[PDB]
């Protein structure tokens, strides 16, 4: 439903942010 | 509705964050 | 409207985060 | 109340994130 | 528990973001 | 309660993001 799906979309966008931030960290110290 | 539309705007902004962070990761990767 | 205004302030802050991240990505791109 | 204050605290933490991201962008292109 | 699980996935993703940001900060510090 | 505790964990993680981003900003500033 509208609210459950909105929170899922927020979680998914934050997982994409987390992946990219780990890629940036890994470029500096991996 | 007001709550649904605010949660949609939060998801949209986070997707823009995610895309920019992917571009920063791409710039730093070998 | 306390709940709606707090979600709108979260969206506003994330839009500022997205603007700044896009500025960082542009600074690093060719 | 518990939920209104929690969302305010989330907005405040995101404003601090936004300020720091703008400082990073400004260090690169200001 | 769909609403609680989506908020917990948001927290999980943000903890991953925080870990990666701390790794970036450590890479840049003296 | 479950919703209150998830929102507290989201705020805590974002404060950790904010602190790390402040440290990255400090590293890059003159």
Residue numbers in the entry:
A (entry chain A), B (entry chain C), C (entry chain B), D (entry chain A), E (entry chain B), F (entry chain C): 1 to 30
What does the published report state?
αHBs are oligomers of 5 or more α-helical peptides that assemble into coiled-coil structures with central solvent-accessible channels. The αHBs are loaded with an environment sensitive dye (in this case, 1,6-diphenyl-1,3,5-hexatriene, DPH) that binds within the channels and fluoresces. Accordingly, challenging the array with analytes leads to differential displacement of the dye across the array to give a fluorescent fingerprint.
Despite the requirements for aliphatic residues at a and d, up to 40% of these can be changed to other side chains without compromising barrel integrity. Focusing on the small molecules, the αSA signal from the more-polar AAs and CHOs is dominated by the polar and charged Group II and III αHBs.
